[PDB]
Design an enzyme around this catalytic site. Structure first.
Site, PDB file in Angstrom:
ATOM      1  N   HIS B  73      41.254  48.157  45.110  1.00 33.72           N
ATOM      2  CA  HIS B  73      41.619  48.882  46.334  1.00 33.72           C
ATOM      3  C   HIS B  73      40.787  50.153  46.497  1.00 33.72           C
ATOM      4  CE1 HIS B  73      45.239  46.274  46.042  1.00 33.72           C
ATOM      5  NE2 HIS B  73      44.976  46.212  47.332  1.00 33.72           N
ATOM      6  N   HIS B  77      36.508  47.253  49.157  1.00 30.91           N
ATOM      7  CA  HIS B  77      37.551  46.490  49.837  1.00 30.91           C
ATOM      8  C   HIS B  77      37.704  46.948  51.281  1.00 30.91           C
ATOM      9  CE1 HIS B  77      41.224  44.416  50.743  1.00 30.91           C
ATOM     10  NE2 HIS B  77      41.948  45.522  50.753  1.00 30.91           N
ATOM     11  N   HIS B 113      43.001  51.425  55.976  1.00 34.70           N
ATOM     12  CA  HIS B 113      44.288  50.782  55.694  1.00 34.70           C
ATOM     13  C   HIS B 113      44.731  50.884  54.238  1.00 34.70           C
ATOM     14  CE1 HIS B 113      42.078  47.440  53.896  1.00 34.70           C
ATOM     15  NE2 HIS B 113      43.232  46.969  53.468  1.00 34.70           N
ATOM     16  N   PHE B 285      48.219  31.367  44.675  1.00 37.78           N
ATOM     17  CA  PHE B 285      48.015  32.331  45.756  1.00 37.78           C
ATOM     18  C   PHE B 285      47.571  31.631  47.035  1.00 37.78           C
ATOM     19  CE2 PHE B 285      45.148  35.887  47.453  1.00 37.78           C
ATOM     20  CZ  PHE B 285      46.195  36.576  48.055  1.00 37.78           C
TER      21      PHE B 285
HETATM   22  C1  LIG Z   1      41.298  37.693  44.927  1.00 34.66           C
HETATM   23  O1  LIG Z   1      42.694  37.506  44.706  1.00 34.66           O
HETATM   24  C2  LIG Z   1      43.552  38.352  45.355  1.00 34.66           C
HETATM   25  C3  LIG Z   1      43.171  39.307  46.281  1.00 34.66           C
HETATM   26  C4  LIG Z   1      44.139  40.112  46.884  1.00 34.66           C
HETATM   27  C5  LIG Z   1      45.481  39.979  46.563  1.00 34.66           C
HETATM   28  C6  LIG Z   1      46.504  40.863  47.214  1.00 34.66           C
HETATM   29  O2  LIG Z   1      47.426  40.025  48.000  1.00 34.66           O
HETATM   30  C7  LIG Z   1      48.705  40.214  47.539  1.00 34.66           C
HETATM   31  C8  LIG Z   1      49.850  39.597  48.041  1.00 34.66           C
HETATM   32  O3  LIG Z   1      49.711  38.732  49.090  1.00 34.66           O
HETATM   33  C9  LIG Z   1      50.885  38.398  49.838  1.00 34.66           C
HETATM   34  C10 LIG Z   1      51.070  39.923  47.452  1.00 34.66           C
HETATM   35  C11 LIG Z   1      51.160  40.833  46.404  1.00 34.66           C
HETATM   36  C12 LIG Z   1      52.488  41.159  45.756  1.00 34.66           C
HETATM   37  C13 LIG Z   1      53.417  42.080  46.554  1.00 34.66           C
HETATM   38  C14 LIG Z   1      54.274  41.346  47.558  1.00 34.66           C
HETATM   39  O4  LIG Z   1      55.309  42.170  48.075  1.00 34.66           O
HETATM   40  C15 LIG Z   1      49.993  41.427  45.923  1.00 34.66           C
HETATM   41  C16 LIG Z   1      48.769  41.120  46.498  1.00 34.66           C
HETATM   42  C17 LIG Z   1      47.380  41.631  46.206  1.00 34.66           C
HETATM   43  C18 LIG Z   1      47.270  43.138  46.364  1.00 34.66           C
HETATM   44  O5  LIG Z   1      47.429  43.587  47.703  1.00 34.66           O
HETATM   45  C19 LIG Z   1      45.866  39.029  45.620  1.00 34.66           C
HETATM   46  C20 LIG Z   1      44.916  38.220  45.013  1.00 34.66           C
HETATM   47  O6  LIG Z   1      45.186  37.264  44.069  1.00 34.66           O
HETATM   48  C21 LIG Z   1      46.543  37.108  43.672  1.00 34.66           C
HETATM   49 MG   LIG Z   2      47.200  47.743  51.352  1.00 28.66          MG
HETATM   50 ZN   LIG Z   3      43.882  46.004  51.587  1.00 26.95          ZN
END
Ligand SMILES: COc1ccc([C@H]2Oc3c(OC)cc(CCCO)cc3[C@@H]2CO)cc1OC
Ligand SMILES: [Mg+2]
Ligand SMILES: [Zn+2]
Ligand SMILES: COc1ccc([C@H]2Oc3c(OC)cc(CCCO)cc3[C@@H]2CO)cc1OC
Ligand SMILES: [Mg+2]
Ligand SMILES: [Zn+2]
EC number: 3.1.4.53
Lengths: 324, 324
Positions: B73, B77, B113, B285
């Site tokens: 983050h 990103h 963001h 995911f």
């Molecule tokens: C390259 O892989 C990734 C890239 C980005 C992500 C992001 O998306 C999500 C998410 O999506 C619905 C839910 C949660 C948990 C909290 C739900 O309240 C966390 C994340 C990551 C950080 O914001 C996750 C990834 O892999 C798991």
């Molecule tokens: Mg965010």
């Molecule tokens: Zn983001």
């Protein structure tokens, strides 16, 4: 003077407590002494193992963070909302309905619900690009602030009145308090009332004749509306109290309007001291906001609130009669 | 270096921009140079009378408030989500949907963001009683903060890129940016997706198939889901980009889980390095979050998202093949 105050506090279970007299007799500590009395009445110190010295220290610090120089949104209003919520919680239609933790959350939420209020509205804070509105992204600006201050003060020396709750109890209480205080944002009034109307129209009562509330959403909605009714209870009080509250909100409104006019902004409704009708504004306030809300609350707990509704209707008639 | 940086920027209109090279070639200013290029490509500096030097001053200040020691983050990103949103706004099915101010709000929202992100989740901040969660009453804690920082930095010297917008444009832009960034809170994913699904089942289009969105509530919803799609676009990018994003998010997750283990908290899903499968996590995911979202999006803009969807399904196939 100590005995005089104790005599007055014997009315803590009654609608129309002389809260301005308690403020005087307590040395401007109405929120502290009314909260302490209510906690003793409900046995909340023993139930939650709250040390009395911690309770008093927190209450005095919370009371200090209300502004003594705002006419309406001060520690007397906080004490009034606390005591009004305490009476509403005692209504027969709710007997044994809420847990001790929910009762604690509703009273604590009332106590903190306007803390550090600057005496101007959310829209004024938004339109002047205030630091508060920048912090809170224009969304329930005051109410988020009241919550943050109310919880932050628990971290001052000997102020954590929740130190002996379990982790689960603290987490549940915190969530309920947040849900309740955010619901006191006046811009949510129409949505809150529509949901309360729906609950009345679908009301269920147990074998014991009390309200059946068997999920978090219904339980928190009743507590939200209860504290909102308490917040909007001034026109339901004996006239000599109601008129003092009107004098005070009009002072706050007119001073906001003076700042709006001075800044070249449009003056908010009821805030222009040169073109205001205090009496017409109170009748409209009752007719479009307060009586719709209280009539619906009275239906939820019928017939418990009939006398409160009768007083509101009498006070409406009186203000109306000063117009003609 | 600046000449090859320029050649990479020639693909700002393409999915799969080489954002990591651009970060390296720009001396770790991918957000500044990508935002600048997009503002020129969309003619936003002329449309809104934004002085170039103010655009750069703000962009570098904003970039500075992304943390260099958080693996995911950070400013790379932010630059990627900005660029991804820019491409989604060019979807043919959306050709005449959004005004210039709406385009501006979605892009600015993308840039800010995640600003000042500490590298841990909202739940971590809530369960550790962080200052942020105390400020924001456990509600969209990170996203409220990203907004507050992003707007506050506009008040730094020569940082007000909106100085020449009318007062009403500024008010409208602020509202839309807030509505968009708040919707990037991952806890709201299923609600956002549900509304996108409803939009698809109630979809109205021209004979050409261009989306017709008449009311603000529908338009802001598309913009919310669009920036959400861009935030969640890593698995739809070319594999060698996606694999880099996976390495980075897993480093961030594992550092948080180490903090949860050590504190005695439940370890968040996918955060326990001793019991994690990076590849199974990516496939889960995609199956449960990213593909349901992008397939619903694809249907809304049918068929212009088909190549993105195809690549997502290919990358899913590849990550699945790495599980023995
Ligand atoms: C390259 O892989 C990734 C890239 C980005 C992500 C992001 O998306 C999500 C998410 O999506 C619905 C839910 C949660 C948990 C909290 C739900 O309240 C966390 C994340 C990551 C950080 O914001 C996750 C990834 O892999 C798991
Ligand atoms: Mg965010
Ligand atoms: Zn983001
Ligand atoms: C004793 O009279 C009062 C006591 C308390 C009130 C409070 O309720 C309301 C309110 O509720 C629907 C809407 C607004 C918006 C006003 C825009 O200018 C303000 C208030 C007062 C402050 O919180 C108003 C009173 O009279 C009008
Ligand atoms: Mg209030
Ligand atoms: Zn109040």
């Amino acid at each position: 003077q100590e005995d005089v105050l104790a005599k007055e506090l014997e009315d803590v279970n009654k609608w129309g407590l002389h809260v301005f007299r308690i403020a005087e007799l307590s040395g401007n500590r109405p929120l502290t002494v009314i909260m302490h009395t209510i906690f003793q009445e409900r046995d909340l110190l023993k139930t939650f193992k709250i040390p009395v010295d911690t309770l008093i220290t927190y209450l005095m610090t919370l009371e200090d963070h209300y502004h003594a120089d705002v006419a309406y949104h001060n520690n007397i209003h906080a004490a009034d909302v606390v005591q009004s919520t305490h009476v509403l919680l005692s209504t027969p239609a709710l007997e044994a309905v809420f847990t001790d933790l929910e009762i604690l959350a509703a009273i604590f939420a009332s106590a903190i619900h306007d803390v550090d209020h600057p005496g101007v509205s959310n829209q004024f804070l938004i339109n002047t690009n205030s630091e508060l509105a920048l912090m809170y992204n224009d969304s329930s600006v005051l109410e988020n602030h009241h919550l943050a201050v109310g919880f932050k003060l628990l971290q001052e020396e000997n102020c954590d009145i929740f130190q002996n709750l379990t982790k689960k109890q603290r987490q549940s209480l915190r969530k309920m308090v947040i849900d309740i205080v955010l619901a006191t944002d006046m811009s949510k009034h129409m949505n809150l009332l529509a949901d309360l109307k729906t609950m009345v129209e679908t009301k269920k009562v147990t074998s014991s004749g009390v309200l059946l509330l068997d999920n978090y959403s219904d339980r928190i909605q009743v507590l939200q509306n209860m504290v909102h009714c308490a917040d909007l209870s001034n026109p339901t009080k004996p006239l000599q109290l109601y008129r003092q509250w009107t004098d005070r909100i009009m002072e706050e409104f007119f001073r906001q309007g003076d700042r709006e006019r001075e800044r070249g902004m449009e003056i908010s409704p009821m805030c222009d001291k040169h073109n205001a009708s205090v009496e017409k504004s109170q009748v409209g306030f009752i007719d479009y906001i307060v009586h719709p809300l209280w009539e619906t609350w009275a239906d939820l707990v019928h017939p418990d609130a009939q006398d409160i509704l009768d007083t509101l209707e009498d006070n409406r008639e009186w203000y109306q009669s000063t117009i003609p």
